[PDB]
Amino acid sequence: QQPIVTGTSVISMKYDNGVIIAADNLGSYGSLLRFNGVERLIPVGDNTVVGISGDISDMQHIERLLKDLVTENAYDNPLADAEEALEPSYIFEYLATVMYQRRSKMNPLWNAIIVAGVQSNGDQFLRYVNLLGVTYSSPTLATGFGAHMANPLLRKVVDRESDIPKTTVQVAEEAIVNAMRVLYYRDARSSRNFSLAIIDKNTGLTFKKNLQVENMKWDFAKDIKGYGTQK
Amino acid sequence: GSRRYDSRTTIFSPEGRLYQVEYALESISHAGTAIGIMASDGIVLAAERKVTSTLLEQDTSTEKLYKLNDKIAVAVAGLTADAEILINTARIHAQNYLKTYNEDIPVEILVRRLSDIKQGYTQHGGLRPFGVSFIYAGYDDRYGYQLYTSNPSGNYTGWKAISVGANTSAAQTLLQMDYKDDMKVDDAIELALKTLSKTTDSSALTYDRLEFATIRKEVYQKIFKPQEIKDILVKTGIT
Amino acid sequence: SSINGGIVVAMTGKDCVAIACDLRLGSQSLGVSNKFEKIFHYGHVFLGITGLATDVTTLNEMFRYKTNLYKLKEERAIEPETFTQLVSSSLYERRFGPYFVGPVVAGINSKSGKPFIAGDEAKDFIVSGTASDQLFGMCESLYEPNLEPEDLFETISQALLNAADRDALSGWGAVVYIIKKDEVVKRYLKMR
Amino acid sequence: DRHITIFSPEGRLYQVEYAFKATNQTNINSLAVRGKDCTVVISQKKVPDKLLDPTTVSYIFCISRTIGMVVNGPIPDARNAALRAKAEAAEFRYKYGYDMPCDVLAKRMANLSQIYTQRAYMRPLGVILTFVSVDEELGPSIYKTDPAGYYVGYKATATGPKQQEITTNLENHFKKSKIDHINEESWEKVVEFAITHMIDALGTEFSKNDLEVGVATKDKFFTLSAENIEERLVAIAEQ
Amino acid sequence: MDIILGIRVQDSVILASSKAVTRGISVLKDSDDKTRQLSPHTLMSFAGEAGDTVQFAEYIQANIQLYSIREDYELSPQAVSSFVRQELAKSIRSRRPYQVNVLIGGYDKKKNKPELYQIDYLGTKVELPYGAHGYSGFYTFSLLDHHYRPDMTTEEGLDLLKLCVQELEKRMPMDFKGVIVKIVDKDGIRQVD
Amino acid sequence: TSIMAVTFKDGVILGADSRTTTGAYIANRVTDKLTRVHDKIWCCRSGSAADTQAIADIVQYHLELYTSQYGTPSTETAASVFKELCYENKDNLTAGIIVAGYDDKNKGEVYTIPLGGSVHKLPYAIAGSGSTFIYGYCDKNFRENMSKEETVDFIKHSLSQAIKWDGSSGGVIRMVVLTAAGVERLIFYPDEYEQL
Amino acid sequence: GTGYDLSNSVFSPDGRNFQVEYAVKAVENGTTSIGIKCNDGVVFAVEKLITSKLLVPQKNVKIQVVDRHIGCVYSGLIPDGRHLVNRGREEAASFKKLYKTPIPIPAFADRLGQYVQAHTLYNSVRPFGVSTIFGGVDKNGAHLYMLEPSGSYWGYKGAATGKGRQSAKAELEKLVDHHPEGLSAREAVKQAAKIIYLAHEDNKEKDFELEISWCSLSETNGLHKFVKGDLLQEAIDFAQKEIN
Amino acid sequence: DRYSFSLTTFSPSGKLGQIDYALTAVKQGVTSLGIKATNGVVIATEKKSSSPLAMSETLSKVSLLTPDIGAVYSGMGPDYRVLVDKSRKVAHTSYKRIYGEYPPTKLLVSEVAKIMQEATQSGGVRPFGVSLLIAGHDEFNGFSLYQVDPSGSYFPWKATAIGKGSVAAKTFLEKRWNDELELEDAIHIALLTLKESVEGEFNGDTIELAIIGDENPDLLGYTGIPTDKGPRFRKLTSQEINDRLEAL
Amino acid sequence: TTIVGVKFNNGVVIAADTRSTQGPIVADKNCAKLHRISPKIWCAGAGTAADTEAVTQLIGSNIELHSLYTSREPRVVSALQMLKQHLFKYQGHIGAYLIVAGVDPTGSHLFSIHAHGSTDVGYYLSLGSGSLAAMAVLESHWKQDLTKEEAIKLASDAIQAGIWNDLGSGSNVDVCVMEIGKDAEYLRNYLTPNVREEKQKSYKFPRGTTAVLKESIVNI
Secondary structure (H helix, E strand, O other): OOOEEEEEEEEEEEEEEEEEEEEEEEEOOEEEEEEOOOOEEEEEEEEEEEEEEEEEEHHHHHHHHHHHHHHHHHHHOOOOOOOOOOOOOHHHHHHHHHHHHHHOOOOOHHHHHEEEEEOOOOEEEEEEEEEEOOEOOEEEOOOOHHHHHHHHHHHHEEEEEEHOOOOOOOHHHHHHHHHHHHHHHOOOOOOEOOOOOOOOOOOEEEEEEEEEOOOOOHHHHHHOOOOOOOO | HHHHHHOOOOEEEEOOOEEHHHHHHHOOOOOOOOEEEOOEEEEEEEEOOOOOOOOOOOHHHHHHOOEOOOOOOEEEOHHHHHHHHHHHHHHHHHHHHHHOOOOOOOOHHHHHHHHHHHHHHOOOOOOOOOEEEEEEEEEEEOOOEEEEEEEOOOOOEEEEEEEEEEEEEEEHHHHHHHHOOOOOOHHHHHHHHHHHHOOOOOOOOHHHHEEEEEEOOEEEEEEOOOHHHHHHHHHOOOO | OOOOOOEEEEEEEEOEEEEEEEEEEEEOOOOEOOOOOEEEHHHHHHHHEEEHHHHHHHHHHHHHHHHHHHHHHHOOOOOHHHHHHHHHHHHHHOOOOOOOOEEEEEEOOOOOOOEEEOOOOOOOEEEEEEOOOHHHHHHHOOOOOOHHHHHHHHHHHHHHHHHHHHHOOOOOOOEEEEEEOOOOOEEEEOOO | OOOOOOOOOOOOOHHHHHHHHHHHHHHHHHOEOOOOOOEEEEOOOOOOOOOEEEOOOOOEEOOOOEEEEEEEHHHHHHHHHHHHHHHHHHHHHHOOOOOHHHHHHHHHHHHHHHHHHHHOOOOOOOOOEEEEEEEEOOOEEEEEEOOOOOOOOOEEEEEEOHHHHHHHHHHHHHHHHHHOOOOOOOOHHHHHHHHHHHHHHOOOOOOOEEEEEEEEOOEEEEEEHHHHHHHHHHHHHHO | OOOEEEOOOOOOOOEEEEEOOEOOOOOEOOOOEEEEEEEEEEEEEEEEOOHHHHHHHHHHHHHHHHHHHHOOOOOOOHHHHHHHHHHHHHHHHHOOOEEEEEEEEEEEOOOOOEEEEEEEOOEEEOOOOOOOHHHHHHHHHHHHHHOOOOOOOOHHHHHHHHHHHHOOOOOOHOOOOEEEEEEOOOOEEEEEE | OOOOEEEEEOOEEEEEEEOOOEEOOOEOOOOOEEEEEEEOOEEEEEHHHHHHHHHHHHHHHOOOOEEEEEEEEOOHHHHHHHHHHHHHHOOOOOEEEEEEEEEEOEEEEEEEEEEOOEEEEEEEEEOHHHHHHHHHHHHHHHOOOOHHHHHHHHHHHHHHHHHHHOOOOOOEEEEEEEEOOOEEEEOOHHHHHHOO | OOOOOOOOOOOOOOOOOOOHHHHHHHOOOOEEEEEEEEOOOOEEEEEOOOOOOOOOOOOOOOOOOOOOOOOEEEEEEEHHHHHHHHHHHHHHHHHHHHHOOOOHHHHHHHHHHHHHHOOOOOOOOOOOOOOEEEEEEEEEEEEEEOOOOOOOEEEOOEEOOOHHHHHHHHHHHHHHHOOEEEHHHHHHHHHHHHHHHHOOOOOOOEEEEEEEEEEEOOOOOOOEOOOOOOHHHHHHHHHHHHHH | OOOOOOOOOOOOOOHHHHHHHHHHHOOOOOEEEEEEEEEEEEEEEEEOOOOOOOOOOOHOOOOOEEOOEEEEEEEEEHHHHHHHHHHHHHHHHHHHHHHHHOOOHHHHHHHHHHHHHHHHOOEEOOOOOOOEEEEEEEEOOOEEEEEEOOOOOOOEEEEEOOOOOHHHHHHHHHHHHHOOOHHHHHHHHHHHHHHHHOOOOOOOOOOEEEEEOOOHHHHHHHEOOOOOOOOOEEEEOOOHHHHHHHOO | OOOOEEEEOOOEEEEEEOEEOOOOOOEEOOOOOOOEEEEEEEEEEEHHHHHHHHHHHHHHHHHHHHHHEEEEEHHHHHHHHHHHHHHHOOOOOOEEEEEEEEOOOEEEEEEEOOOOOEEOOOEEEEEEOOOHHHHHHHHOOOOOOOOOHHHHHHHHHHHHHHHHOOOOOOOEEEEEEEEEOOOOOEEEEEEEOOOOOOOOOOOOOOOOOOEEEEEEEEOO
C-alpha cells in the first residue's frame, strides 16, 4: 500500500550481442540514505538478470519467488540445464502475471521490474513490468527517475532497433556508466556505488559489482557565488 | 471404507416398512403407559412410572410429563433423553412463534413441527430415529382443548382419548368402553386412573408409581404433587 | 436513541421498590403516541427500557423468550439479580452493533424479600433516558432512605413529573408501579 | 465390533486391547525412576542391523526443555505422539505464559487417546507414553499414558514384555527402603541404580550401545551419549 | 414523498394513499395503488424508497398467504403487524434495509374490531386510532386530534379524511395527484372515493 | 526509543533505553525493551509495543517448536520468522525489529527489520526515534572486532546522545551481551552516562 | 489373519496392521534401489528394467531430486513414490519459506514419516506401496534414510529395497566392513553400480538400465546431481569387470 | 470422517445394543455410591490401583464440577474424565456466563445427560461407558443426588450405588437410609457400604470420599465479600477417612 | 477513574476510586472497580466499564477452567497472556485498560495492560484520568522496602490525590491486598472521605400531593 524502503532507478540497454542492465546499491528510507549494500540486480541462471526498483521488501519476495521457480523448473527435468532451462521470456511472463494478479487483488507488489536477458536463439530480451502489470519493450528501458534522464542519453545511442546491430558492448557500457553518473548528479536518492550486469549471447553473463561513479566534475562550483547579486 | 459398518437406517424393507421405525415402536411398547383424555372442560394426562425403588425421589423425578408452554404439556413414552432433546426444541419453537406473532403457538403447529423433526431422521442423515412417542395436551382459541399423539415415524393424529406405551391395546379397549364426550375433567381423572390400574403390570397402582397433570380453565396447567395424587387415588377408591 | 425520547426511574423503599416511566412515543419533535409503556415485567421482575422504541420492543420480546425458557427449565421464576445478569450478557452480546437502550431492573427477591434495582445494584435510585440529568437532580434532592410505599410513591412521582416537565421529548402522562412482595399497584399520573 | 472402537456385548473395546498388544511389537523394555531432584529413564536399544546408523535409533524424545518422553511401541506412532506433544507444549507456553507441566501434557495426550477410543474413524495409537520431568511444583514426576486414555503418576515404572519382572524388583526395593524415591543427591547415581536394576531384572549385561538413557533435571531434560553411558557402566563395574 | 393515511372508526379501517409516482423531474404515473391485500380482512399500505416498498409488501403478502394455506386460517391483524414489525426490525440490521413505512389496517373477526397499526422502517409499531407517515401527519393530525371520535361511522370517517386531504392539497407544496381510498370492514376490503 | 545492536570480536551486544511514552507522558520509565526469543537470540523492539510484543511472543513460540523438532535455530532463521510476520502483516503492524544472536559458527550476527519487513544483515544496527541523532556518531565511531569494553562504551556513548536529544528516549541504558560464555545483562544509570 | 486384513488401520488380535504388511509385499515386488553413505555425501542407484527395446534409453528417470540437495529413490508402486516426493517438495518449500535455510535431512525424513504414517490411521486411505531411500547433505553433513510403508524410518550407512534387497544388503554389509574409514563418493558410485549389477543376478528375466545419482560436498558442492557420461560408463565398466 | 451414520441402532426387539453394552461396562466398574442427608450429600468410591508403583493420589475419581456440585463415576475412567471437562465448560458457557451464577445441580445434570445422549445418536461415536453420580446443592432445590446413565437418562436418588457391588450396596442403603439422617451418619453408612465391597484393603488411600455440605469460607481464598459463599464441595483427606474408620 | 497498583515486600496492593461517570454526570457514587479474576488474582479497569467487566468475566471463567484442568493454582502470567491476546485480537476496539495484580506459586506480580494488548511489569502503576496525580504521589513516596501497611497507605494516598484533583475520580477508596501465602484481603470502602452533609430540610411530601388518575393491581 505504501513503499517504505526503496531502491530507485534501474537502467538497461540492448546492444548488438546482448543486454546491459545497471542499478545502484542503495536502500533509502524516505530521505534517509539508510541502507547502502542492497543488491537490486538478481541473476536468474546464466541468461537472465532481473533488475528491481521500488519497495525492497517486495523485491526480496520476488527474489525468493525466482529462486523457487528455478528449483521447481529443475524437478523431473533432466534438461533444466539445457533446452528446458528458464528463458528470460518465461521469467518475465511469470513476474508480469504475479504483478497483475496482485494489482487486481488491490495488494500490489510496489515495484518496477526490468527483465534483461538473451534467449536461447540469441535474441535480446528486454522488457519492463510495473506494479500495475503494465508491460512494454524498447531498446532502452529505465525505471523511475532514470526514465526521465537516462533514456534520453541511451536513446542517443540506440534510437531504433536498426541501431542495435551498430552498437558495441563498449559503447553501451560507457553510455550506461555515464547515465549512472548523471543520475548521481541529479537524483537525491541515488548512490555513487552501483552494480552492472552484461548478458552476452557469446560471453554469457558478466556481473560487475561495487562499481563507483567516477570522473565527476565539480570544480566549476568554486565560481558560483550567491544567488544573484552577491559578488 | 466405513460402508461396511453402516446399518442403513432410512431404507425401506421389501414390504415398504421402515424397520428402524418399527423397532423404535417396539421399544416404546416396553415403556410406561401414558394416557390422555379430552374432557369437555379440560384434558387429563396420566402416566405410570416404570422405574421404582424406595430410594428414588419421586417428589423431584419428573420423567413422564413436561410443560412445553403455559398452554401445552406432553406425556412421554420411550427414551427420556431423546424426549428431552425434542421437548427443548418444542419449547424454543413455541417461544419463537410468540416472538414473531405475539400470540401463543397453536397446538397443531407445535405438534407438526416436532413430528417433522422426527420424520427427517427417518428419511435422511443416516441416524437412528428418536425412540419416543408423545401425547400432547393443549388448549388454543381456535379448536380449544386438543389431544394429539406422535410416534417415531412423525405421524401425528388427534384423539378424544389415547394411550401410548406398553398396554395400549387394553387401554384403548377400556377407554372405548367408558369414554363419553360429555364427561368432565373429574370424570376423566377417574377413567384415567381406573384404566392405568386395570392395565398396570404391577401388583397395585400407588401414588409413587404415578405422574398426573391437567389442563383446565384462563386455562391453568397443573402437574399434580404426590400428595394430590394420594388425594385423587383415595377419592377414586383405588387406594 | 433520542429519536423517540423517554425516561425511566426506579427507587427502593422500606421493603418496596418503585419503577416509573413516561408514556410518550415520539418521532423527533412529532409526538406519535401516549400509550407507549416502557415498563415490562417477567413474573415479579420489572424491566424499564428507554431509548429507541424498536429496540425497546425487540428486547422486551427477547427477554420474554428467555425468561419463559428459564421458568420452564428452572421450574421457578427468575429473580431480579439473575435477570440483571441476563440483561447485561444479552446486551454485551451485541457489543458491536449495540441495542441503543437503557435498561432499569426493579423487583423484590422472592426468597429474601430484599428490594433490588439495577441499571451495579445502586440501591437508592436509578435513572435512565433523555431527562436523566434532571432526574438525578430531583432524586438526589428528594430521595430519603427507608420511605414507606406511600411516601416512595409521592417521591418518585414528583421526581418524574418535575424532571419530565423540563424535557421536551418525554411526558404526555406517566405510570408508576409500586412493588411489594405481596402486591403491585399501577398508578397513572396526569402531567401538566 | 472387533474392527472398530464400539462396545462388545461384554463392554470391551477389542481394538484398544489389540493396540496394547502392538505396544510390545518392539520387544523393548523401559524403566523410569525418581530421584530427589531428578528423573531417569532407561530404555533398551536393540540395533541388530549393522547397516543402521545407531544414533538415529531412539525411542526417547525431548518434548520440551523440561519434559522427556519415552515410548514403548512402534516408532511411527511414537513419532506421531512426540510431534503432537511438542506442539501441545509449545502452544501451552504460548497461551498460558508458563511451561506445560508433565502431568498436564499426559492428561492432554490421554484425552486424545480417549477420543481415538470413542470416535470410530481414528484408530488408537499402538504406543505407551511415559512422560518425565522435574516439575516446578510437583518435583520429579513420572506420568504414563496408554491406548485406553488412562494415565497416572508413578513413583517408578517399567514398560515392555518384562515389565512385571522390573516392576516387582522395584517394588521389593521400595519395600526394602521404605521411600517413594531413590535417595541419592545426583543423577549419575540414579542412572547407575536404574541400570543395575535393569540388569538384575533382565539378567543381561549391557554395553554402552545396548541402552539409551534420559535424565530430567530442574533445568532441562537431556539424553546421554553412548560415552556417558560408558562412564556410568564402568562406574557400576568399579563401584 | 408519498402520503399514506389511516383512520380506524367504530366499524372499519379507512386507508388513503396518494396516486402519484415521481421519478426525478417527471410525474410518471397518476394512478398508482400503494397497497397490498395481505388477507381478506387485512390491508397494508406502504411508503418509502422506490423498489423497496413493493418488494417488501409482496414478500409479506406471499408469507401471509403461505401461512393461511398451511393453517387454513387467517392471522389476526395483530399477528400480521407483529410479523411485519419483525421483518422491518431485522432489515435495520441487515446489509441493505428496506426503507419502508407501512400502515396495516385489519378487521379482527374474532374480536369483531377494526385495528390500525403504524410501523416505521425502524420497526416502531404502534396501534393508533388514526395514523400517517412522513409529513402527512404534520398537516393532518391537528384535524384528527380536533375532530376524531371513536364512535364515528365510516361516512364520518371519510368526511374527516376529505378534510385532511383538502388541507394537504392546500398547504403541502407537492402535487400528490389525490388519494385512493380503501375500506376494511367485516365484509372485507373495498375501494371508495 | 533508542535501540542498538553491535557485533564485536566475541559476539553481539544489544542496547536500549528504558523510556515508554504516551504523547509527552512517560508511561513507563523503566521499560525493558530487550526481549529474549531464544536462549542466545534476542530482539530489540521499536514502534508499537502491542505489535512488537505480539510478534515476539509468536516468534518465541515458533522457535520453541523449531527447537523441539529441528534443533537450535540460527539467528537468520529467527530473523526470517520475524520477517514473515512483519511482511505478511505490514499493513496492520508498525514494527521495526532489531534481531541479534550468537552461535559458535557464525559468532554474533545482527539483522534489522525496518518497517515494511525488509531484512538487512549488518555489523551494527541503530533504530528508533533517537537513532536519527546518532547516525553520524555511530558511522564515525564503529569499527569491526572491538573488544567487549570498547563496544559497551560505544553503545553507552551513542545511546547517551540519543537520550540527550530525543524526548522519546531516556531512563536507564540496558544491555544484553551474547557470547560463548553466556548471556549477561548490564544496566547503566543516568548519573553514569550523562557525564559522558 | 483373514478377518482383520480387509481394512487399513484395524489392529489384528496380535496387534498387526495387515494392510501395511501387504503394502510391504508390494514393495518387495519392486525393482532394486540402493543408497550408500560416503564420507561426505550419499550415492543413490536404481535398477530400471528394460521391459522392451522400445523404451527410450536414459529417459524414464526414476530418481527424483527434492529441493536442490535431497535425492529420493524408491521401490514398489512408482506412482506412490511420486506422490510422496510431491509432498516432500511441498514440505521442503514450506520449510525454506518460513526458515530460509534448506530443510535438514532429518526434518524432511520426519515430515515424510508423518505423512506416510498418516496413511495408516484411516480405512479411507491405502498405505504407500513404496519404500523410499532418500538423503542428502546438510549443514551437519550427509544423511541416508530408508522409509517403510508403516512410516518407520531410520538412518542407515547403506540401504536396499526391492526384489534384490537381500543380496544388495549383504554386499553393503561387506562394503561397510571393508571400508570402516568411510568410502569416497566416486568409489561409492562404482560400488553402487556393482551392487545393482549383482542384485540383477536375481530378477534376470529382463535386461536393465542402471541409473545413479549422488550428492557430495566435494563432488557436487552438496547439490544432488545425476551421474552421467564418463563416470557412469566407468561405473558400469567396473561393475561388469567385477562380474566378468 | 466417513462415519456420518449412527453406530447405535434399534434391534428388532427395540434394544439399543450399544447402550446395553455400555451399561455392562459400567456394571463391571468399581463400586461407587451416594447418600443424601438432610444437611449434605456423600459420594464415595474405591480407588483401585493399577500398580503398587502408581500414585493413586494423582488420579481423581471424585471431581469438583462447581463449588457446590461434585461427581463420581463407575465404568470407563477416561470417558468420565472427558465428561468432567465438558461438564465444567458447559456449566460456565451455558449458565455462569449468562446468569452470573453457577447452575443448579439438575440443570448441569441435564447438560451432561445431553452430552451423553448425543453419543447414542450422532454419527460415528459409541456411547460413554460410564454412569455418573452427581451430588450438589442449590439455594432453591437444596441438596440433590442424581444418577446419569450412558443413555443420558437421569434419576434423582435418596441413596444409590453403581458398579459391581451396587445390588448389595443398594440393599444395605435401603436398610440404613432414613429421612432424619445427618451427614456424619451418611458418611458412616457410606464407609460401611464400601467396606462390604472393597477387595480387602480398606483405608484412606483406597477410598475416595467427598461431601456436599456447609460452605467452607477457608477454602474460598479471599475475604471481604460477605455474600460470597465458600465452596460446599469438599473432598475428605485420607487422614480424615482414617480417623473416621478407626472410630467406625 | 483512578486505579493504582503497588508491590510491597511480600505482596501487592491494588486500589481504586469508586466513582462511575456518564460524561459529567456521576452515574454511580460507589462502583466496585476491583474485579476478581481468581481468588488471589485481581484486576481493575479504566476505560469503558462494560469492556472491563466482560473481559474480566471471560478471563476469570477460562482461568477457573484452566485451574481445574491443571489441578494447579492459576498464575498471573496466564491471566496476562490471555488478556493480552484477546485485546490484541480486537485491535484496541475493546477499550479496557487494566492493572492486573496477584499472587501465585511463583510469587507476587503486578502488570498493566493497555487496550491494544501492550503490557508492562512494574513495582508501582497507575491508570485512568487520575493516573497523573496518583503517579506523582507514587513517584514521591514509593520505596523498594515497603511493608504492607506502608503500601496500603501509599496506594490510598495516590487514590486520594486522584479523588481530590481529577474530576473523573471521587468518592471512596477500595483496596485489595494480596500477600504471599495468605488469603486476599478485599477492603471495600477502606476510606470514605466524601460523605454528603445533611440537607437543610426534609423533602418528604405529604401523602396526596400527587394527582392520580387511576389505580390498578398488577397480577404477578
